Amino acid sequence: RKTQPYDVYDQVEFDVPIGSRGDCYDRYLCRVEEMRQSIRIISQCLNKMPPGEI
Amino acid sequence: VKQDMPPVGGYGPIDYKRNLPRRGLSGYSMFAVGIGALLFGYWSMMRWNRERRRLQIEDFEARIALMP
């Protein structure tokens, strides 16, 4: 997403969790923080919706 | 007329913070309630053991006096 713009991802801002060292627990924490940052991206996308065309 | 779907005046923010209030206690509180209730139980059962040994000696005086 943040390395290759293939859609309107260049105009939205978030952060993505990276792993400490292995440890499936940390992978679980990574999933949960991607969920909460997904909620932030949806809030930004409702802030930036133009009524142009279908 | 055009009646598509825009938002209404800009939507309010939605939180991103961990509402984890760390509902707490203390080791001093654990120490106080544990040693208090524990020593309370010790003293109470100690006094009941003393009254119960009174009863037990009474039962023995019954069986000794009856026996011959």
Question: What does this entry look like structurally?
Answer:
This is part of a larger assembly, with chains A (54 residues) and B (68 residues). Chain A contains one helix and no strands. With 54 residues, chain A is an all-alpha fold. By secondary structure, chain B is mainly α. Chain B has one helix spanning 27-66. The longest helix of chain B has 40 residues, at 27-66. The radius of gyration of chain B is 35 Å and the shape is rod-shaped. The chains are: A mainly alpha (54), B mainly alpha (68). The A-B interface holds A 36-37, 39-40, 43, 46-47, 49-51 and B 2, 4-7, 10-11, 13-14, 16. It is classed as electron transport. Keywords: supercomplex, cellular respiration, mitochondria, electron transport.
Q: For the CA atoms, what is the radius of gyration of chain B?
A: 35 Å
Q: What gross morphology of chain A would you assign?
A: elongated
Number of strands of chain B: 0
Strand content of chain B: under 5%
Strand content of chain A: under 5%
Distance between the termini of chain A: 24 Å
Largest sheet of chain A: none
Q: Count of helical segments of chain B?
A: 1
Estimated radius of gyration of chain A: 14 Å
Q: What oligomeric assembly is this protein in?
A: part of a larger assembly
The span between the termini of chain B is 118 Å
Structural class of chain B comes to mainly alpha
Write down the overall geometry of chain B: rod-shaped
Number of strands of chain A: 0
Tally of helical segments of chain A: 1
PDB class: electron transport
Keywords: supercomplex, cellular respiration, mitochondria, electron transport
Entry title: Ovine respiratory supercomplex I+III2 closed class.
Chain A: ndufs2
